[PDB]
Design an enzyme around this catalytic site. Structure first.
Site, PDB file in Angstrom:
ATOM      1  N   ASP A 266       0.803  -1.212   0.000  1.00  0.00           N
ATOM      2  CA  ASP A 266       0.000   0.000   0.000  1.00  0.00           C
ATOM      3  C   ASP A 266       0.840   1.268   0.000  1.00  0.00           C
ATOM      4  O   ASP A 266       0.279   2.362  -0.104  1.00  0.00           O
ATOM      5  CB  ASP A 266      -0.943   0.017   1.208  1.00  0.00           C
ATOM      6  CG  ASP A 266      -2.240  -0.721   0.947  1.00  0.00           C
ATOM      7  OD1 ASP A 266      -2.713  -0.708  -0.208  1.00  0.00           O
ATOM      8  OD2 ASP A 266      -2.789  -1.312   1.899  1.00  0.00           O
ATOM      9  N   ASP A 313       0.789 -12.033   7.923  1.00  0.00           N
ATOM     10  CA  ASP A 313       1.328 -10.731   8.266  1.00  0.00           C
ATOM     11  C   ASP A 313       2.792 -10.648   7.839  1.00  0.00           C
ATOM     12  O   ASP A 313       3.434 -11.649   7.511  1.00  0.00           O
ATOM     13  CB  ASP A 313       1.184 -10.463   9.761  1.00  0.00           C
ATOM     14  CG  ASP A 313      -0.212 -10.023  10.141  1.00  0.00           C
ATOM     15  OD1 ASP A 313      -1.055  -9.870   9.232  1.00  0.00           O
ATOM     16  OD2 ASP A 313      -0.469  -9.827  11.348  1.00  0.00           O
ATOM     17  N   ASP A 315       5.519  -9.959   9.480  1.00  0.00           N
ATOM     18  CA  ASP A 315       6.523 -10.493  10.390  1.00  0.00           C
ATOM     19  C   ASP A 315       6.345 -11.974  10.689  1.00  0.00           C
ATOM     20  O   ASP A 315       7.159 -12.538  11.427  1.00  0.00           O
ATOM     21  CB  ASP A 315       6.508  -9.700  11.699  1.00  0.00           C
ATOM     22  CG  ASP A 315       5.109  -9.511  12.247  1.00  0.00           C
ATOM     23  OD1 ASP A 315       4.166  -9.397  11.438  1.00  0.00           O
ATOM     24  OD2 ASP A 315       4.952  -9.477  13.485  1.00  0.00           O
ATOM     25  N   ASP A 410     -11.012  -9.204  10.376  1.00  0.00           N
ATOM     26  CA  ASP A 410     -10.945 -10.661  10.407  1.00  0.00           C
ATOM     27  C   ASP A 410     -12.113 -11.259  11.183  1.00  0.00           C
ATOM     28  O   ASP A 410     -12.782 -12.189  10.711  1.00  0.00           O
ATOM     29  CB  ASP A 410      -9.612 -11.083  11.019  1.00  0.00           C
ATOM     30  CG  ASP A 410      -9.228 -10.230  12.213  1.00  0.00           C
ATOM     31  OD1 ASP A 410     -10.003  -9.317  12.563  1.00  0.00           O
ATOM     32  OD2 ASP A 410      -8.152 -10.469  12.799  1.00  0.00           O
TER      33      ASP A 410
END
Ligand SMILES: Nc1nc2c(ncn2[C@@H]2O[C@@H]3COP(=O)(O)O[C@H]4[C@@H](O)[C@H](n5cnc6c(=O)[nH]c(N)nc65)O[C@@H]4COP(=O)(O)O[C@H]3[C@H]2O)c(=O)[nH]1
Ligand SMILES: Nc1nc2c(ncn2[C@@H]2O[C@@H]3COP(=O)(O)O[C@H]4[C@@H](O)[C@H](n5cnc6c(=O)[nH]c(N)nc65)O[C@@H]4COP(=O)(O)O[C@H]3[C@H]2O)c(=O)[nH]1
Lengths: 793, 41, 45, 144, 144
Positions: A266, A313, A315, A410
């Site tokens: 993004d 995600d 990480d 979510d």
């Protein structure tokens, strides 16, 4: 004048005294202290037979076993301490038919419920209540030492009976309808405790029976395996944190014909575009940035063409077994539309980093991802938790993609899928590890966002009153949403005794003995039942610390939504303001209570003691919270994971030596060599790592040599070397499972001792820095008295 | 031995692990070296 | 007054009430254990 | 130079002094504080040789026995020597019954408990100096 | 020896002494502080060999049993030996009624909870020192 001393005193004793005086003068100790010490020594050796070899042998290992006593540091009232410790030690110890079966169940259940009602609603005299307490507590203790699920159910039912008894007693014979001030606050406390009881009951229901779902083996044919698309949405994370995720994804043990990895950006960053081009994965950078991560994922779905979508995600690094351990159920249940995987954090959390307990205490989130989601699995209420999940794209297209309304997208999309009839599943094995929040502020912020989203879902979708959705699912979702409304009850609990101590207001109109005989069994049974149920997930009395850290920051946003690299150690004053304010209020209350214990009515002697012990517990909790708010030093660019693997090192002259890898990070390793074979602080070394039977070589440079321990720094690796290194260090499907299984069990007394030490450490931390100077003196005085008492236990 | 460690840790006695990375490396090796391809098949 | 009569029956009997509570706990635990086993088997199929 | 090991204390005779003090507290003993203090000073007075210390102990054992016998209200042994013939002329069964009746088991139990307490408190309470202090206090009381 | 590490404690006799104390507090005991103190000293007497320790415990078990029987208000052995034949010849109903009247469930519950508390304490708080102190206090109160 030495002649007079030599004549009066035998020369050996005179020399001993002179030497001791000189030693204490050199160390700055007072001469009077030396005289008192010698006086005590002589009076003991004449009034106490220190010549006994038994006591000499005890003194031989006294320093190692009892290092808290120093023979070279005299202090006032030392013999009192010796006698007290001696007294502590001497005290201390060194089938059938349908109708018949249904009728039998009915009669058994009604008899048991009638007995439980009698047990709950039986008035007692204090001795009878105490006997009842001891008997039921002993039953709980016996059932504790019995592994299995039947014992868990027994403890749940016993705790429910005790808690219902407590609530019945509170609602019947504690509310004092005499005063307009001893009524409003008393009812406020009663409502807080009723909310806590409801939360406890719903939590017991939620984890009453963990499903313990197991992976279903995939078909032997590789042509029946489905196509999976992996999404990695990024907004502002540096490439150094997404590289490992992408490298681990490229090494997933799934057919490459049926695995597409996408990088969603993004930020429109060109470095990510070039990285995607170099590694061979896909890339999407949408022009319009709307709906944040949900909108990014929807735009990605607009281009991706795969049966399954797995969201990771930035990480979170997946293990190579992730898809094989996950995809089995999707081919077994056609109605399944969502699978969840635990969230593990190899990075130390703010609590673990600041409080110094990283591998000792379990993580904050391992209770949820270890027991709560497994409990939700039975009732088909396992909701999407952001990452480490797979969603079938056919159900996800019917609902219009990821929900974009709430900030917790979510949970919203999982709720929609459950409301359209699709099921969900949970798998216990940790197959992905991420980075924890780097500071207390980050944890507060992410919890605030989660709570805001959950309250938004409660207000908008309202799982209690909607469309087709099972009742157990409703209860699980509303419990998850009520978990974030516990700030107000926690504030009430922390500020309740201050009512009575400051402004005379009998919150509970009962003798202190009856309060101790009714409230205490509730707490004891709750603690025991949780310690058995959430055994290797959360240590006792720690949930209150998290709750009090979050409460002041979660209560305002939740209520509003209901209506509508540490260079130097420091204390986060802005974060810690509420804790300091509550500490000031509670300690001014304890000063007023100390006054009232003497200048107040004598009949209110036990009540003041009860209020004071409540204030002391509050102060310990708040001190732990403050101890969280001091950030420890962090100068490591990459976080290290302690893992023991055999390895080997290769030098440029061709000599190989064995070594044991002790920790690894993104750009380095730490090894131990038995004897420091051959290595110097700048030499290049090839590091040999084995993944099963295959050996991999990685160029390294030595950074530190401290005897057996050697620190290595990774050389610039190629893409294939990066993939191999991730597969040999991070994406191993054994590190996280054994990490979670190595957590020590829950010992309530040791946990209490640790929390007390943590509160003392937090007070000592605040005894150095002070926002309002005035608080400095008070904190120093408190720490002084506290350590004096600790030295006199 | 990671899968072996998982099996020893948390049940999983019937999940046969398909190491597709090893298979793909072996296929690429057989394509690259005609001697290995000749002897294997 | 029937609840008064029941309370007066066991006014000073803690051992008996402990026995009754343990009996109720064990029986309710058995019923819940059976029901949860049934639901677990239906859930994994 | 371990010259201090010549002043060791009265370990072994502390039970003697404790029993005598208990009897005095119970009123069953005719106490002479000066003689007891002289005996304590003699016991605490060092001797050049360890063999000399053993000889002193062997000499004092009859001395201690005689002092304990005389401090009690029992008649002098000379009367026993003179009247041994008359005692032998009496019936032996009556003498056995009398000696079985005379022994007081309460004092024997108290002595056993005191011995146990002295063997235990010889860990935390050095009995020699306490005995010396109590004897000095009794001597001061009897002098003034 | 140099250490005399044989003061291992009363061990299981702490529960025996606690039961005696509780019964005395209830008022059903003819307590003998001197005999209890002598028995405690016998139990705490240091012995070098473990075999002698075990033999001492085995010998003290019937001695403690007899002392507990004596300290109660139950009739002596003479009545039992004289009425054993009558009890054997009595009907079963009378014996059952006597047994039912002899057993108090409150006493059994108190003994059981005291045993559980003693177990918990002996796990965390040793009891030999407390028992010795209580016995000494009772002896001092009775003698004075
Ligand atoms: N030059 C250098 N020396 C290293 C490095 N890693 C370890 N050492 C050395 O090894 C000692 C042991 O550190 P540890 O086992 O990691 O155990 C460490 C670790 O748990 C913690 N610690 C210290 N500094 C940091 C930090 O910046 N970040 C984190 N996360 N922990 C730190 O404190 C413990 C004691 O550390 P020290 O007192 O500094 O003592 C350190 C230090 O002398 C490294 O990367 N570079
Ligand atoms: N696993 C592992 N890797 C090691 C070890 N020693 C060095 N490395 C790797 O080598 C890099 C350079 O460390 P440095 O030259 O000692 O320079 C270090 C050192 O001066 C300091 N530092 C980091 N951690 C510690 C620590 O625990 N204690 C101390 N005293 N200094 C530390 O920060 C610098 C940057 O370190 P990093 O960012 O961690 O980056 C580290 C890390 O990737 C080791 O014992 N174990």
């Amino acid at each position: 004048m030495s002649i007079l001393t030599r004549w009066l005193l035998i020369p050996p004793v005179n020399a001993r005294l002179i030497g001791r005086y000189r030693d204490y003068r050199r160390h700055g100790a007072s001469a009077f202290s030396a005289t008192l010490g010698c006086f005590w020594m002589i009076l003991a050796w004449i009034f106490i037979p220190l010549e006994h070899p038994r006591w000499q042998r005890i003194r031989a290992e006294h320093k190692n076993l009892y290092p808290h006593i120093n023979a070279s540091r005299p202090r006032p009232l030392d013999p009192v301490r010796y006698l007290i410790q001696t007294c502590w030690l001497l005290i201390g110890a060194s089938h059938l038919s349908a109708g018949a079966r249904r009728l039998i169940l009915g009669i058994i259940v009604t008899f048991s419920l009638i007995l439980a009602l009698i047990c709950v609603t039986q008035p007692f005299n204090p001795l009878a209540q105490f006997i009842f307490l001891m008997l039921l507590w002993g039953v709980a203790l016996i059932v504790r030492r019995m592994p299995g699920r039947f014992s868990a159910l027994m403890l749940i039912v016993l705790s429910l009976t005790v808690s219902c008894r407590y609530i019945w007693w509170r609602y019947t014979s504690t509310l004092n309808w005499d005063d307009p001030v001893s009524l409003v606050c008393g009812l406020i406390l009663l409502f807080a405790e009723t909310y806590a009881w409801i939360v406890l009951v719903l939590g017991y229901f939620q984890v009453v029976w963990p499903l313990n779902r197991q992976p279903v083996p995939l078909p032997k044919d590789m042509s029946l395996w489905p196509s999976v698309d992996i999404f990695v949405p990024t907004y502002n994370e540096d490439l150094n944190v997404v590289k490992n995720t992408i490298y681990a994804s490229l090494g997933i043990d799934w057919p490459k014909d049926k695995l597409n990895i996408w990088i969603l950006d993004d930020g429109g960053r060109e470095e990510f575009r070039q990285f995607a081009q170099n590694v061979g994965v896909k890339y999407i950078a949408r022009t319009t940035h709307e709906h944040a991560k949900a909108g990014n994922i929807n735009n990605a779905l607009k281009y991706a063409k795969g049966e399954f979508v797995s969201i990771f995600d930035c990480d979170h690094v997946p293990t190579r077994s992730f898809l094989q351990m996950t995809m089995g159920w999707f081919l077994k249940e056609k109605q399944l539309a969502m699978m969840q995987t635990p969230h593990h954090f190899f990075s130390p959390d703010p609590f673990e980093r600041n409080l110094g307990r990283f591998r000792k205490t379990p993580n904050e989130g391992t209770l949820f991802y270890g027991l709560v989601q497994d409990g939700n699995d039975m009732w088909d209420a396992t909701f999407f938790c952001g990452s480490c999940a797979v969603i079938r794209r056919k159900p996800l297209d019917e609902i219009g993609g990821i929900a974009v309304e709430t900030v917790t997208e979510d949970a919203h999309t999982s709720l929609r899928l459950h409301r359209r009839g699709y099921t969900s599943a949970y798998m216990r094995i940790p197959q992905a590890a991420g980075l924890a929040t780097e500071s207390l502020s980050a944890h507060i912020g992410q919890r605030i966002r989660w709570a805001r989203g959950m309250v938004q879902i409660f207000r908008l979708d309202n799982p209690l009153t909607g469309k087709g959705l099972k009742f157990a699912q409703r209860l699980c979702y509303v419990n998850a949403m009520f978990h974030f409304l516990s700030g107000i009850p926690r504030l009430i609990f922390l500020t309740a005794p201050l009512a009575f101590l400051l402004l005379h207001a009998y919150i509970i109109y009962a003798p202190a003995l009856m309060i101790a005989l009714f409230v205490l069994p509730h707490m004891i049974h709750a603690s025991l039942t949780n310690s058995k149920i959430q055994g290797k997930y959360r240590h006792s009395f720690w949930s209150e610390i998290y709750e009090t850290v979050l409460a002041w920051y979660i209560a305002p946003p939740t209520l509003v939504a209901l209506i509508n690299l540490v260079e130097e150690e420091y204390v986060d004053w802005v974060i810690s303001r509420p804790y300091i304010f509550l500490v000031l209020l509670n300690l001014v209350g304890v000063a007023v209570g100390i006054w009232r214990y003497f200048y107040g009515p004598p009949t209110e002697m036990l009540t003041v003691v009860v209020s004071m012990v409540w204030v002391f517990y509050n102060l310990i909790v708040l001190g732990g919270a403050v101890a969280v708010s001091v950030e420890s030093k962090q100068v490591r660019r990459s976080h290290r994971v302690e893992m023991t693997m055999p390895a080997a090192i290769a030098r440029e002259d061709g000599h190989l030596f064995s070594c044991t890898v002790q920790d690894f990070s993104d750009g380095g390793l730490g090894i131990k060599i038995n004897g420091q074979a051959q290595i110097l602080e700048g030499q290049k070394v090839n590091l040999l790592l084995k993944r099963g039977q295959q050996e991999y070589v990685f160029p390294t440079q030595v950074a530190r040599v401290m005897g057996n321990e050697v620190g290595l720094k990774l050389m610039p690796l190629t893409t294939q070397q990066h993939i191999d290194f991730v597969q040999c260090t991070f994406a191993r499907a054994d590190t996280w499972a054994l990490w979670q299984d190595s957590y020590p069990e829950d010992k309530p007394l040791e946990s209490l001792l640790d929390i007390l030490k943590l509160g003392f450490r937090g007070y000592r931390h605040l005894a150095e820095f002070a926002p309002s100077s005035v608080k400095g003196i008070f904190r120093v005085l408190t720490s002084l008295v506290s350590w004096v008492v600790s030295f006199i236990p | 031995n990671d899968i072996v460690a998982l099996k020893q840790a948390f049940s999983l006695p019937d999940i046969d692990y398909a190491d597709i990375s090893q298979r793909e490396q072996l296929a690429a090796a057989l394509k690259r070296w005609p001697l290995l391809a000749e002897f294997a098949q | 007054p029937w609840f008064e009569r029941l309370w007066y029956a066991l006014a000073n009997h803690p051992i008996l009430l402990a026995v009754l509570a343990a009996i109720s706990v064990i029986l309710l635990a058995w019923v819940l254990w059976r029901l949860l086993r049934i639901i677990s088997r239906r859930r994994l199929n | 130079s371990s010259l201090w090991q010549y002043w060791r204390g009265l370990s072994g005779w502390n039970f003697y002094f404790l029993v005598k003090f208990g009897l005095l507290w119970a009123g069953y003993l005719n106490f002479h504080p000066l003689l007891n203090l002289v005996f304590a000073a003699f016991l605490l007075m060092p001797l050049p040789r360890y063999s000399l210390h053993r000889l002193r102990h062997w000499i004092a054992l009859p001395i201690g026995f005689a002092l304990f016998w005389h401090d009690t209200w029992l008649p002098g042994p000379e009367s026993i020597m003179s009247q041994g013939s008359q005692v032998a002329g009496f019936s032996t069964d009556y003498l056995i019954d009398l000696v079985t009746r005379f022994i007081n088991w309460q004092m024997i139990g108290a002595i056993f408990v005191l011995l146990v307490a002295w063997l235990f408190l010889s860990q935390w309470i050095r009995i020699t100096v306490f005995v010396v202090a109590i004897l000095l206090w009794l001597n001061v009381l009897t002098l003034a």
